[PDB]
Structure 1
């Protein structure tokens, strides 16, 4: 919805946003939103996500598709009315994104998803990219396990020439929807085939917001290597603009730079990861805050 501020209420929002990353218990926002989701009336539509066509499919709290649902309208504080209607397996009225209110007045946060190696990590979309020798897929899995902590991470596999990989975009959207409804830490391997359709353009623009609203993290690899003067800027956009956090390989083998948006209008933070390989290419992130500026951010985006 729209929100109204004065100096005092604005200062209160920024303190709340700052807390949401810096001092909240890691993973507490996710537990909170899981509570909101479980308390919705049994058959309420909770999430809509674009399929390849630009149509939207709709899910309930248990990540089952809604196929038919008769018009229902809800009135917000700002006077806005939201109306949801599903017909023949597709949204007739509504919008893409969360169909129930997960946030209230607390918007523009990067809720802390996990702490690891003495650093807090933000929920939302994490793009793992870069150029050079360091392998993206082993890193996404290392980070999934590490931010998972005591919990298992969910793996969505898409668009690679390997066994059991789904290559149909509509199944991909179904996987991702289910992952965000049911798990705090999610890995996507890979965004290669997404980076095209209206659905594909909807996902890139939606997923960070959906994830941050939930308090889950989606850790996605993206090889920028299609080296054409159109796709290569869909990649740099994706990474600059469409991500909550960026994990970029460096000059040095096994070393990665993590750049984090900590919230709306807040400082972007940075830290480095050192990594090494064990048996069967299982990567370990070694374990035992620094602000980055828009000059140094565009510098790393190179």
Structure 2
């Protein structure tokens, strides 16, 4: 919904947004939104996501797909009427994203998802990309575990020529829904095949804010190196302004650079990861914050 501000009320939104990443207990926003999801009546639609055609599929709080739901309309705070309707397994009226209010007035945040190695990590979409000697898949799994902490992490597998991997985009979105509805740390391996149909374009657009609103983190591996300035510059704009955080490999082997976005109109943070392999290619991230200005973000986007 739309929000109204003056100097004073704006000043305290920023104050609150800063707190959401810098001071709030790690993982606490996810906890709060689980409670908001649990207080929804069974059967009520909570999440709608785009399938391959551009049609949307819809889910309840238990990640059950809704097949039929008679028109229901709420009156939001600004007078706006939200209309939800599912017919023959697809959405007939409504919008992609959260069909319930998780954020209320607290919008434009990067709610902290976890602290690891003395670094705070933001929820939203983290894109693991780059070019060269470093391998992305071992990193998403290693980073998934590390941000998992006490919790197990979810692994969505899509579009790779390996056993068990699903290659259907509609099963893929059905996966992501369940994961965001039920888990704080989600790994997508890989995001390559989506990058383009209507529902695929919708995913790139939508998944960052879905995850950021939930307070869960989606860590996706995206591999370019294509060198086609028709597809490599979509794997550069997606990384640019479609992700909340960005993890990109450097010239030094086993070294990665993290660019976290800390909130609406706040200063993007940076830090560097050192990594090594163990038995069966299992990667470990070692333990033992600078502000990064613009034109340095462009200078890092050397993926050609």
Q: Do they fold alike, i.e. is TM over 0.5?
A: yes
Kindly provide the CA deviation profile for residues 232-261 of structure 1, in whole angstroms up to 9, marking residues without a partner as x: 111101100100000000010000000010
**Range moving further from structure 2, 223-232 or 55-64:** 223-232
Which residue is 2:173 aligned to? 173
TM-score of the aligned structures, taking structure 1 as reference length? 0.99
Instruction: Tell me how large the CA RMSD over aligned residues is.
Output: 0.6
Deviation of 1:230 (Å): 1.4
Cα offset for 1:227? 2.1
For residue 226 of structure 1, report the CA deviation from its aligned partner: 2.5
Deviations 1:29-80 (A, max 9, x none): 0000000000001111000000000000000000010010000001111111
**How many Å apart are 1:225 and its aligned residue?**
2.0
Indicate the SS of the match to 2:200: helix
Give every structure 1 segment of 4 or more consecutive aligned residues whose post-TM-superposition deviation is greater than 6 Å.
none
Give the aligned length: 302
Q: Quote the residue 1:208 is aligned against.
A: 208
Q: Which residue of 1 aligns with 2:64?
A: 64
1: CA distance, partners of 2:100 / 2:226: 38
Aligned equivalents of 1:93 and 1:227: distance in 2? 41
1:118-172 deviation digits (Å, cap 9, x = unpaired): 0000000000000110100000000000000000000000000100000000000
Q: Secondary structure at the match of 1:294?
A: coil
Q: CA deviation at 1:231?
A: 1.2
How much does 1:228 deviate? 1.6
> Which sections of structure 1, spanning at least 5 residues, go unmatched?
none
Give the alignment's TM-score, normalised by structure 2: 0.99
Whole-Å separation in 1 of the counterparts to 2:228 and 2:53: 25
Superposed CA deviations along residues 94-139 of structure 1, whole A, max 9, x for unmatched, are 0000000000000000000000000000000000000110100000
Quick one: distance in 2 between partners of 1:292 and 1:2?
30
